[PDB]
Design a protein around this ligand. Structure first.
Ligand SMILES: CCN1C(=O)[C@H](c2cc(O)cc(-c3cccnc3)c2)C(=O)N(c2ccccc2)c2cc(C(F)(F)F)ccc21
Ligand SMILES: O=C(O)c1ccc(-c2ccc3c(c2)nc(-c2cn[nH]c2-c2cccc(Cl)c2)n3CCCn2ccnc2)cc1
Length: 131
């Protein structure tokens, strides 16, 4: 996350989270916990976390599809320092430096916060699917 500059979530925190998500798989109480954990997150942070958490293969694919759908919608709503496109917000086509750039620009585009809402949309769809 960006702190008072960028620093990775600590390994101890991420590894503990992996176990929490496993124990609480597919339950909605994970969602607010995700929001708390990812305070200040860049898209790079978020992808490291998602990749570390891993989990259920079909669920991961559904999350990915949801993200891609939201990135497409972002491009429709906000066609394009350069401005980020959907894939930049998802951290696919952007660097960590670029993400920090947008997040701290005057005025800013909070690419981490935007990506978080896409991830949360996916997590909610997953909750319903496995309920
Ligand atoms: C989408 C992929 N994914 C999993 O497959 C998780 C998972 C992890 C795991 O270690 C085991 C399972 C699992 C599920 C069912 C059977 N056996 C194992 C699922 C899991 O259950 N959820 C999940 C939890 C609650 C609600 C919705 C989804 C999350 C959560 C996140 C995060 F961090 F962003 F919140 C990231 C990936 C992720
Ligand atoms: O959902 C959300 O949370 C959400 C949704 C949208 C936005 C958003 C989107 C585009 C935005 C924006 C804010 N602020 C500006 C904006 C306004 N002036 N300069 C910029 C800007 C230019 C380049 C890089 C960055 Cl970093 C900012 N633009 C660029 C608009 C086009 N423009 C205006 C001036 N130059 C280019 C922020 C948050």
């Amino acid at each position: 996350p960006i702190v008072q500059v960028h620093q990775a979530i600590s390994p101890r925190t991420l590894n503990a989270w992996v176990k929490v998500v496993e124990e609480k798989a597919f339950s909605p109480e994970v969602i607010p916990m995700f929001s708390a954990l990812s305070e200040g997150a860049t898209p790079q942070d978020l992808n490291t976390m998602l990749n570390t958490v891993g989990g259920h293969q079909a669920a991961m694919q559904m999350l990915k599809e949801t993200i891609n759908e939201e990135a497409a919608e972002w491009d429709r709503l906000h066609p394009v320092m350069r401005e980020p496109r959907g894939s930049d917000i998802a951290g696919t086509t952007s660097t960590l430096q670029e993400q920090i750039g947008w997040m701290t620009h005057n005025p800013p585009i909070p690419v981490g916060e935007i990506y978080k809402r896409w991830i949360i949309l996916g997590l909610n769809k997953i909750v319903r699917m496995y309920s």
